Amino acid sequence: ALEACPQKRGVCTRVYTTTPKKPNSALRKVCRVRLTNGFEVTSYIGGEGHNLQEHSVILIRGGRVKDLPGVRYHTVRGALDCSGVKDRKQARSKYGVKRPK
Template sequence: DVPALQNCPQRRGVCTRVYTTTPKKPNSALRKVCRVRLTNGFEVSSYIGGEGHNLQEHSGYVIRGGRVKDLPGVRYHTVRGALDSSGV
């Protein structure tokens, strides 16, 4: 369920914060996550997949649906290779 996309396949937004967070038990890691303010006014958490990233505050993002099962509240993925994010 991805309400912030409003029936669109992707949405564009601007990053407000990049941080790492730890997953639920029994997993252990530092997952890369960013907070994104979308063009439709929503502000959501989005997972940054892949090894290494160049994403920082005030850079443009495209997010897609797709939750991360071991991170509560993270229901979106960033699209790598679009706008300011480099490809993997």
């Protein structure tokens, strides 16, 4: 986070998929982000589905993904272009999802 900041905005460079390590197997969704800090790191995209393109531009929280070595940050859904998970009836605090009527 550089300036020891809780969060840090940035613009996605590419939204590709990655495969877990030896014990796990899947297509985890990640994305290279060029934070304002001046660093280009990879962040994980929580949720069952997202809408992050090339010029996504999202805020970074910070969290390592055990399965994906290198991914030390998590994207904050519900902020900027990163739309909150759809139909999230559960932990809406995370994934940034407004409580349905």
